[PDB]
Structures are given as C-alpha cells and as structure tokens.
Amino acid sequence: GKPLVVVYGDYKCPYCKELDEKVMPKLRKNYIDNHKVEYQFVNLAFLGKDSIVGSRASHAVLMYAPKSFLDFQKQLFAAQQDQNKEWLTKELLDKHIKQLHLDKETENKIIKDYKTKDSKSWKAAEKDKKIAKDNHIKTTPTAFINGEKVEDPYDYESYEKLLK
C-alpha cells in the first residue's frame, strides 16, 4: 500500500523542532495532505515529565481532529522553550488546542480526553514509548519510510529520494 513515513521525536527536542520547520511544510504539501503517504509521529516523551502530557494532548488532537493535527504540531514546536523547563503545561496545551478554532464540543472532547487517565490518547502516548523501544530507536529525531532510514531527516529531498 501507501508508503509509511515515521518520525521519532519529542515536542521538547530542539532538533525535532528543526526537522518540523525544515521538512514538514514540503512533505505535507507534496505527500501527506494529498494522501500519497501515511505519516506517523512517535513521541519518545523522554525530555521531562511534561513531555508525556504534551504527547497525550497531541494524540487527542490526532484522533478527534486529524485535519488539524499537522497545524497543531507546527504551532506546538514553534512554542518550544528550554527543555529543562516543564513548559508543556495543561494551560499551554489547552491554549494551543483552542488555537485550532474547532467547534466547541470537539475542543472540549480533546481537552478532557488527554487529561483522563487511561483514555485512548493516554494509552496512545504510553504506546509511543514502547514503539520506539521495540524498534530500537537510539537517537531522535530519526525518520523512516517503509522501514528504510532517511539519509538526512532534516532535508526534504532525502525523503523524496526514497519516495521517488
């Protein structure tokens, strides 16, 4: 089927922010939004206890407002602060969710889901950590297309080379 592009990272990871800024605009326009590839972001949530909270919020947005997911990612990475600060607070995340300007009830659904223990977004965030571990991912950010390593994960062309 369709090529699977996987990016391993963390919203607090500085380099992961660079990948988003340098690669996603073109990757999104040329392969993701036109449905030529599947895109999956696996959050290791390893840079502080707030990392996992941001991951839950992110997964909630993905499951309830998928068409707003990439904007959510871009805007969240853009707000990145010092990784030694637990800057991924519920206050900031709720604000970012409300910035998506979704219908009121969808917005409330997302907000409640990521704050609810064992919810689907809660489970998805935990699972991401298992995926990275089982896939033996030793550095972030790293990207793969159908399991093949992207030579330079910071260069859109490196992804293209693999996608044809």
mmCIF file with all atom_site columns, C-alpha atoms in Angstrom:
data_model
loop_
_atom_site.group_PDB
_atom_site.id
_atom_site.type_symbol
_atom_site.label_atom_id
_atom_site.label_alt_id
_atom_site.label_comp_id
_atom_site.label_asym_id
_atom_site.label_entity_id
_atom_site.label_seq_id
_atom_site.pdbx_PDB_ins_code
_atom_site.Cartn_x
_atom_site.Cartn_y
_atom_site.Cartn_z
_atom_site.occupancy
_atom_site.B_iso_or_equiv
_atom_site.pdbx_formal_charge
_atom_site.auth_seq_id
_atom_site.auth_comp_id
_atom_site.auth_asym_id
_atom_site.auth_atom_id
_atom_site.pdbx_PDB_model_num
ATOM 1   C CA . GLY A 1 1   ? 0.000   0.000  0.000  1.00 0.00 ? 1   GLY A CA 1
ATOM 2   C CA . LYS A 1 2   ? 0.876   3.611  0.664  1.00 0.00 ? 2   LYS A CA 1
ATOM 3   C CA . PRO A 1 3   ? 4.403   4.415  1.955  1.00 0.00 ? 3   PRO A CA 1
ATOM 4   C CA . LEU A 1 4   ? 4.590   4.801  5.742  1.00 0.00 ? 4   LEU A CA 1
ATOM 5   C CA . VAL A 1 5   ? 6.731   7.730  6.887  1.00 0.00 ? 5   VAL A CA 1
ATOM 6   C CA . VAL A 1 6   ? 7.598   7.551  10.571 1.00 0.00 ? 6   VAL A CA 1
ATOM 7   C CA . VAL A 1 7   ? 9.293   10.315 12.532 1.00 0.00 ? 7   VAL A CA 1
ATOM 8   C CA . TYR A 1 8   ? 10.544  9.628  16.056 1.00 0.00 ? 8   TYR A CA 1
ATOM 9   C CA . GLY A 1 9   ? 10.873  12.619 18.342 1.00 0.00 ? 9   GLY A CA 1
ATOM 10  C CA . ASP A 1 10  ? 9.667   14.721 21.260 1.00 0.00 ? 10  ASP A CA 1
ATOM 11  C CA . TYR A 1 11  ? 7.982   18.146 21.302 1.00 0.00 ? 11  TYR A CA 1
ATOM 12  C CA . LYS A 1 12  ? 10.711  19.287 23.690 1.00 0.00 ? 12  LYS A CA 1
ATOM 13  C CA . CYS A 1 13  ? 13.553  18.076 21.488 1.00 0.00 ? 13  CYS A CA 1
ATOM 14  C CA . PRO A 1 14  ? 15.284  21.124 19.883 1.00 0.00 ? 14  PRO A CA 1
ATOM 15  C CA . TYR A 1 15  ? 16.461  19.207 16.818 1.00 0.00 ? 15  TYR A CA 1
ATOM 16  C CA . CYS A 1 16  ? 12.987  17.746 16.343 1.00 0.00 ? 16  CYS A CA 1
ATOM 17  C CA . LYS A 1 17  ? 11.810  21.348 16.063 1.00 0.00 ? 17  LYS A CA 1
ATOM 18  C CA . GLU A 1 18  ? 14.328  21.917 13.265 1.00 0.00 ? 18  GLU A CA 1
ATOM 19  C CA . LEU A 1 19  ? 13.026  18.878 11.380 1.00 0.00 ? 19  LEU A CA 1
ATOM 20  C CA . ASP A 1 20  ? 9.457   20.171 11.619 1.00 0.00 ? 20  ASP A CA 1
ATOM 21  C CA . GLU A 1 21  ? 10.445  23.623 10.330 1.00 0.00 ? 21  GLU A CA 1
ATOM 22  C CA . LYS A 1 22  ? 12.656  22.324 7.505  1.00 0.00 ? 22  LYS A CA 1
ATOM 23  C CA . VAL A 1 23  ? 10.789  19.227 6.335  1.00 0.00 ? 23  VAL A CA 1
ATOM 24  C CA . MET A 1 24  ? 7.089   19.210 7.175  1.00 0.00 ? 24  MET A CA 1
ATOM 25  C CA . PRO A 1 25  ? 5.961   22.178 5.064  1.00 0.00 ? 25  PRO A CA 1
ATOM 26  C CA . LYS A 1 26  ? 7.037   20.490 1.815  1.00 0.00 ? 26  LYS A CA 1
ATOM 27  C CA . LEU A 1 27  ? 6.391   16.930 2.974  1.00 0.00 ? 27  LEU A CA 1
ATOM 28  C CA . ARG A 1 28  ? 2.854   17.894 3.996  1.00 0.00 ? 28  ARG A CA 1
ATOM 29  C CA . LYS A 1 29  ? 2.041   19.707 0.757  1.00 0.00 ? 29  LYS A CA 1
ATOM 30  C CA . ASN A 1 30  ? 3.659   17.142 -1.512 1.00 0.00 ? 30  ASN A CA 1
ATOM 31  C CA . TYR A 1 31  ? 2.936   13.788 0.143  1.00 0.00 ? 31  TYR A CA 1
ATOM 32  C CA . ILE A 1 32  ? 0.815   13.899 3.278  1.00 0.00 ? 32  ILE A CA 1
ATOM 33  C CA . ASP A 1 33  ? -2.147  16.193 2.572  1.00 0.00 ? 33  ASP A CA 1
ATOM 34  C CA . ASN A 1 34  ? -2.593  14.706 -0.900 1.00 0.00 ? 34  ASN A CA 1
ATOM 35  C CA . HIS A 1 35  ? -2.706  11.268 0.725  1.00 0.00 ? 35  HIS A CA 1
ATOM 36  C CA . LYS A 1 36  ? 0.260   9.705  -1.038 1.00 0.00 ? 36  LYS A CA 1
ATOM 37  C CA . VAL A 1 37  ? 1.898   8.561  2.190  1.00 0.00 ? 37  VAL A CA 1
ATOM 38  C CA . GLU A 1 38  ? 0.853   7.763  5.746  1.00 0.00 ? 38  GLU A CA 1
ATOM 39  C CA . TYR A 1 39  ? 2.559   9.923  8.362  1.00 0.00 ? 39  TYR A CA 1
ATOM 40  C CA . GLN A 1 40  ? 3.154   8.797  11.927 1.00 0.00 ? 40  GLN A CA 1
ATOM 41  C CA . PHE A 1 41  ? 4.877   10.743 14.677 1.00 0.00 ? 41  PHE A CA 1
ATOM 42  C CA . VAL A 1 42  ? 6.214   8.614  17.526 1.00 0.00 ? 42  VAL A CA 1
ATOM 43  C CA . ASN A 1 43  ? 6.857   10.663 20.658 1.00 0.00 ? 43  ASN A CA 1
ATOM 44  C CA . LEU A 1 44  ? 9.522   9.186  22.945 1.00 0.00 ? 44  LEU A CA 1
ATOM 45  C CA . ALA A 1 45  ? 8.425   11.651 25.662 1.00 0.00 ? 45  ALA A CA 1
ATOM 46  C CA . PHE A 1 46  ? 11.875  11.399 27.244 1.00 0.00 ? 46  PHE A CA 1
ATOM 47  C CA . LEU A 1 47  ? 12.718  15.034 27.980 1.00 0.00 ? 47  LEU A CA 1
ATOM 48  C CA . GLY A 1 48  ? 10.858  15.663 31.231 1.00 0.00 ? 48  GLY A CA 1
ATOM 49  C CA . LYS A 1 49  ? 7.614   14.582 32.864 1.00 0.00 ? 49  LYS A CA 1
ATOM 50  C CA . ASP A 1 50  ? 5.687   17.239 30.922 1.00 0.00 ? 50  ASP A CA 1
ATOM 51  C CA . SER A 1 51  ? 6.744   15.591 27.657 1.00 0.00 ? 51  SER A CA 1
ATOM 52  C CA . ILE A 1 52  ? 4.181   12.811 28.071 1.00 0.00 ? 52  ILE A CA 1
ATOM 53  C CA . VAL A 1 53  ? 1.456   15.357 28.823 1.00 0.00 ? 53  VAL A CA 1
ATOM 54  C CA . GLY A 1 54  ? 2.182   17.107 25.546 1.00 0.00 ? 54  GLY A CA 1
ATOM 55  C CA . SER A 1 55  ? 2.131   13.718 23.818 1.00 0.00 ? 55  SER A CA 1
ATOM 56  C CA . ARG A 1 56  ? -1.324  12.903 25.199 1.00 0.00 ? 56  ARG A CA 1
ATOM 57  C CA . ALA A 1 57  ? -2.704  16.260 24.033 1.00 0.00 ? 57  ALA A CA 1
ATOM 58  C CA . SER A 1 58  ? -1.134  15.677 20.618 1.00 0.00 ? 58  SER A CA 1
ATOM 59  C CA . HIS A 1 59  ? -2.641  12.210 20.292 1.00 0.00 ? 59  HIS A CA 1
ATOM 60  C CA . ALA A 1 60  ? -6.047  13.541 21.357 1.00 0.00 ? 60  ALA A CA 1
ATOM 61  C CA . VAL A 1 61  ? -5.889  16.154 18.599 1.00 0.00 ? 61  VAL A CA 1
ATOM 62  C CA . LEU A 1 62  ? -4.872  13.478 16.103 1.00 0.00 ? 62  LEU A CA 1
ATOM 63  C CA . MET A 1 63  ? -7.772  11.186 16.954 1.00 0.00 ? 63  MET A CA 1
ATOM 64  C CA . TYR A 1 64  ? -10.512 13.830 17.176 1.00 0.00 ? 64  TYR A CA 1
ATOM 65  C CA . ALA A 1 65  ? -9.366  16.459 14.682 1.00 0.00 ? 65  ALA A CA 1
ATOM 66  C CA . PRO A 1 66  ? -6.909  14.742 12.279 1.00 0.00 ? 66  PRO A CA 1
ATOM 67  C CA . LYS A 1 67  ? -7.234  17.514 9.693  1.00 0.00 ? 67  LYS A CA 1
ATOM 68  C CA . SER A 1 68  ? -5.844  19.926 12.315 1.00 0.00 ? 68  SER A CA 1
ATOM 69  C CA . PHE A 1 69  ? -3.042  17.640 13.527 1.00 0.00 ? 69  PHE A CA 1
ATOM 70  C CA . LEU A 1 70  ? -0.208  18.970 11.362 1.00 0.00 ? 70  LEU A CA 1
ATOM 71  C CA . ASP A 1 71  ? -1.089  22.588 12.248 1.00 0.00 ? 71  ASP A CA 1
ATOM 72  C CA . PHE A 1 72  ? -1.130  21.576 15.904 1.00 0.00 ? 72  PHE A CA 1
ATOM 73  C CA . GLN A 1 73  ? 2.339   20.040 15.560 1.00 0.00 ? 73  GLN A CA 1
ATOM 74  C CA . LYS A 1 74  ? 3.797   23.039 13.742 1.00 0.00 ? 74  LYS A CA 1
ATOM 75  C CA . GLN A 1 75  ? 2.393   25.541 16.242 1.00 0.00 ? 75  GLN A CA 1
ATOM 76  C CA . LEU A 1 76  ? 3.453   23.469 19.256 1.00 0.00 ? 76  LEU A CA 1
ATOM 77  C CA . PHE A 1 77  ? 7.037   23.030 18.062 1.00 0.00 ? 77  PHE A CA 1
ATOM 78  C CA . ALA A 1 78  ? 7.073   26.768 17.375 1.00 0.00 ? 78  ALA A CA 1
ATOM 79  C CA . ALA A 1 79  ? 6.295   27.457 21.040 1.00 0.00 ? 79  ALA A CA 1
ATOM 80  C CA . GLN A 1 80  ? 9.135   25.247 22.289 1.00 0.00 ? 80  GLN A CA 1
ATOM 81  C CA . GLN A 1 81  ? 11.069  26.640 25.267 1.00 0.00 ? 81  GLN A CA 1
ATOM 82  C CA . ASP A 1 82  ? 14.089  25.461 27.260 1.00 0.00 ? 82  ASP A CA 1
ATOM 83  C CA . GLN A 1 83  ? 13.896  21.672 27.505 1.00 0.00 ? 83  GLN A CA 1
ATOM 84  C CA . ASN A 1 84  ? 14.842  21.914 31.174 1.00 0.00 ? 84  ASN A CA 1
ATOM 85  C CA . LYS A 1 85  ? 11.579  23.732 31.817 1.00 0.00 ? 85  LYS A CA 1
ATOM 86  C CA . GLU A 1 86  ? 8.380   21.712 32.138 1.00 0.00 ? 86  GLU A CA 1
ATOM 87  C CA . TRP A 1 87  ? 6.815   24.101 29.641 1.00 0.00 ? 87  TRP A CA 1
ATOM 88  C CA . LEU A 1 88  ? 4.226   21.618 28.322 1.00 0.00 ? 88  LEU A CA 1
ATOM 89  C CA . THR A 1 89  ? 1.609   22.578 30.894 1.00 0.00 ? 89  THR A CA 1
ATOM 90  C CA . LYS A 1 90  ? -2.106  21.892 30.590 1.00 0.00 ? 90  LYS A CA 1
ATOM 91  C CA . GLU A 1 91  ? -2.574  25.662 30.467 1.00 0.00 ? 91  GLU A CA 1
ATOM 92  C CA . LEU A 1 92  ? -0.366  25.987 27.392 1.00 0.00 ? 92  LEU A CA 1
ATOM 93  C CA . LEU A 1 93  ? -1.711  22.827 25.749 1.00 0.00 ? 93  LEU A CA 1
ATOM 94  C CA . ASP A 1 94  ? -5.350  23.874 26.223 1.00 0.00 ? 94  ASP A CA 1
ATOM 95  C CA . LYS A 1 95  ? -4.479  27.223 24.730 1.00 0.00 ? 95  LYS A CA 1
ATOM 96  C CA . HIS A 1 96  ? -2.879  25.514 21.730 1.00 0.00 ? 96  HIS A CA 1
ATOM 97  C CA . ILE A 1 97  ? -5.904  23.268 21.293 1.00 0.00 ? 97  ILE A CA 1
ATOM 98  C CA . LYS A 1 98  ? -8.215  26.298 21.382 1.00 0.00 ? 98  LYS A CA 1
ATOM 99  C CA . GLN A 1 99  ? -5.990  27.952 18.765 1.00 0.00 ? 99  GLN A CA 1
ATOM 100 C CA . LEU A 1 100 ? -7.157  25.298 16.300 1.00 0.00 ? 100 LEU A CA 1
ATOM 101 C CA . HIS A 1 101 ? -10.561 27.013 16.394 1.00 0.00 ? 101 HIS A CA 1
ATOM 102 C CA . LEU A 1 102 ? -12.510 23.749 16.250 1.00 0.00 ? 102 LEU A CA 1
ATOM 103 C CA . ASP A 1 103 ? -16.188 23.543 17.152 1.00 0.00 ? 103 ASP A CA 1
ATOM 104 C CA . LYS A 1 104 ? -16.683 23.999 20.898 1.00 0.00 ? 104 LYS A CA 1
ATOM 105 C CA . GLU A 1 105 ? -17.647 20.414 21.683 1.00 0.00 ? 105 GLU A CA 1
ATOM 106 C CA . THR A 1 106 ? -14.782 18.864 19.696 1.00 0.00 ? 106 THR A CA 1
ATOM 107 C CA . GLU A 1 107 ? -12.430 21.187 21.554 1.00 0.00 ? 107 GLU A CA 1
ATOM 108 C CA . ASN A 1 108 ? -13.838 20.128 24.942 1.00 0.00 ? 108 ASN A CA 1
ATOM 109 C CA . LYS A 1 109 ? -13.678 16.461 23.938 1.00 0.00 ? 109 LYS A CA 1
ATOM 110 C CA . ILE A 1 110 ? -9.973  16.726 23.113 1.00 0.00 ? 110 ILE A CA 1
ATOM 111 C CA . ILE A 1 111 ? -9.180  18.629 26.310 1.00 0.00 ? 111 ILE A CA 1
ATOM 112 C CA . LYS A 1 112 ? -10.983 16.144 28.536 1.00 0.00 ? 112 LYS A CA 1
ATOM 113 C CA . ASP A 1 113 ? -9.576  13.087 26.768 1.00 0.00 ? 113 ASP A CA 1
ATOM 114 C CA . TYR A 1 114 ? -5.886  13.896 27.201 1.00 0.00 ? 114 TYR A CA 1
ATOM 115 C CA . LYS A 1 115 ? -6.384  14.678 30.897 1.00 0.00 ? 115 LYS A CA 1
ATOM 116 C CA . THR A 1 116 ? -8.294  11.455 31.594 1.00 0.00 ? 116 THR A CA 1
ATOM 117 C CA . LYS A 1 117 ? -6.250  8.531  32.891 1.00 0.00 ? 117 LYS A CA 1
ATOM 118 C CA . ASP A 1 118 ? -6.294  5.505  30.586 1.00 0.00 ? 118 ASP A CA 1
ATOM 119 C CA . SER A 1 119 ? -8.206  7.300  27.839 1.00 0.00 ? 119 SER A CA 1
ATOM 120 C CA . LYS A 1 120 ? -7.355  6.478  24.230 1.00 0.00 ? 120 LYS A CA 1
ATOM 121 C CA . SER A 1 121 ? -4.935  9.414  23.945 1.00 0.00 ? 121 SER A CA 1
ATOM 122 C CA . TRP A 1 122 ? -3.470  8.427  27.301 1.00 0.00 ? 122 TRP A CA 1
ATOM 123 C CA . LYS A 1 123 ? -2.857  4.881  26.054 1.00 0.00 ? 123 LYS A CA 1
ATOM 124 C CA . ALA A 1 124 ? -1.506  6.086  22.700 1.00 0.00 ? 124 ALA A CA 1
ATOM 125 C CA . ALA A 1 125 ? 1.068   8.309  24.413 1.00 0.00 ? 125 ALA A CA 1
ATOM 126 C CA . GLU A 1 126 ? 2.318   5.406  26.523 1.00 0.00 ? 126 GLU A CA 1
ATOM 127 C CA . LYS A 1 127 ? 2.381   3.112  23.486 1.00 0.00 ? 127 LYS A CA 1
ATOM 128 C CA . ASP A 1 128 ? 4.634   5.511  21.574 1.00 0.00 ? 128 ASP A CA 1
ATOM 129 C CA . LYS A 1 129 ? 7.356   4.890  24.145 1.00 0.00 ? 129 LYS A CA 1
ATOM 130 C CA . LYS A 1 130 ? 7.007   1.136  23.609 1.00 0.00 ? 130 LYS A CA 1
ATOM 131 C CA . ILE A 1 131 ? 7.135   1.506  19.819 1.00 0.00 ? 131 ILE A CA 1
ATOM 132 C CA . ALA A 1 132 ? 10.413  3.449  19.927 1.00 0.00 ? 132 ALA A CA 1
ATOM 133 C CA . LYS A 1 133 ? 11.909  0.960  22.370 1.00 0.00 ? 133 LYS A CA 1
ATOM 134 C CA . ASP A 1 134 ? 10.858  -2.141 20.417 1.00 0.00 ? 134 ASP A CA 1
ATOM 135 C CA . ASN A 1 135 ? 12.102  -0.538 17.187 1.00 0.00 ? 135 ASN A CA 1
ATOM 136 C CA . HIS A 1 136 ? 15.473  0.030  18.870 1.00 0.00 ? 136 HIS A CA 1
ATOM 137 C CA . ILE A 1 137 ? 15.497  3.788  18.205 1.00 0.00 ? 137 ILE A CA 1
ATOM 138 C CA . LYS A 1 138 ? 18.718  5.177  19.704 1.00 0.00 ? 138 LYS A CA 1
ATOM 139 C CA . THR A 1 139 ? 18.585  8.833  18.622 1.00 0.00 ? 139 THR A CA 1
ATOM 140 C CA . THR A 1 140 ? 15.996  11.485 17.782 1.00 0.00 ? 140 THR A CA 1
ATOM 141 C CA . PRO A 1 141 ? 14.959  12.854 15.508 1.00 0.00 ? 141 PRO A CA 1
ATOM 142 C CA . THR A 1 142 ? 15.109  9.940  13.061 1.00 0.00 ? 142 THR A CA 1
ATOM 143 C CA . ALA A 1 143 ? 12.794  9.173  10.166 1.00 0.00 ? 143 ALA A CA 1
ATOM 144 C CA . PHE A 1 144 ? 11.972  6.026  8.235  1.00 0.00 ? 144 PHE A CA 1
ATOM 145 C CA . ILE A 1 145 ? 9.944   5.333  5.102  1.00 0.00 ? 145 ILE A CA 1
ATOM 146 C CA . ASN A 1 146 ? 8.719   1.732  4.980  1.00 0.00 ? 146 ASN A CA 1
ATOM 147 C CA . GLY A 1 147 ? 11.449  0.928  7.477  1.00 0.00 ? 147 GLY A CA 1
ATOM 148 C CA . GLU A 1 148 ? 14.269  2.462  5.423  1.00 0.00 ? 148 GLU A CA 1
ATOM 149 C CA . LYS A 1 149 ? 16.269  5.146  7.173  1.00 0.00 ? 149 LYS A CA 1
ATOM 150 C CA . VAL A 1 150 ? 16.049  8.637  5.726  1.00 0.00 ? 150 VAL A CA 1
ATOM 151 C CA . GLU A 1 151 ? 19.670  9.599  4.954  1.00 0.00 ? 151 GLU A CA 1
ATOM 152 C CA . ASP A 1 152 ? 19.220  13.190 6.156  1.00 0.00 ? 152 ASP A CA 1
ATOM 153 C CA . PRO A 1 153 ? 15.996  13.628 8.204  1.00 0.00 ? 153 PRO A CA 1
ATOM 154 C CA . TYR A 1 154 ? 16.411  17.408 8.070  1.00 0.00 ? 154 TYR A CA 1
ATOM 155 C CA . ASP A 1 155 ? 16.316  17.564 4.270  1.00 0.00 ? 155 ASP A CA 1
ATOM 156 C CA . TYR A 1 156 ? 13.039  17.264 2.370  1.00 0.00 ? 156 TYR A CA 1
ATOM 157 C CA . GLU A 1 157 ? 14.971  15.970 -0.657 1.00 0.00 ? 157 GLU A CA 1
ATOM 158 C CA . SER A 1 158 ? 16.213  12.996 1.358  1.00 0.00 ? 158 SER A CA 1
ATOM 159 C CA . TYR A 1 159 ? 12.607  11.891 1.865  1.00 0.00 ? 159 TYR A CA 1
ATOM 160 C CA . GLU A 1 160 ? 11.787  12.498 -1.806 1.00 0.00 ? 160 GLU A CA 1
ATOM 161 C CA . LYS A 1 161 ? 14.757  10.333 -2.827 1.00 0.00 ? 161 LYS A CA 1
ATOM 162 C CA . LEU A 1 162 ? 13.062  7.450  -1.019 1.00 0.00 ? 162 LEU A CA 1
ATOM 163 C CA . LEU A 1 163 ? 9.542   8.220  -2.191 1.00 0.00 ? 163 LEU A CA 1
ATOM 164 C CA . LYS A 1 164 ? 10.805  8.525  -5.797 1.00 0.00 ? 164 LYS A CA 1
#
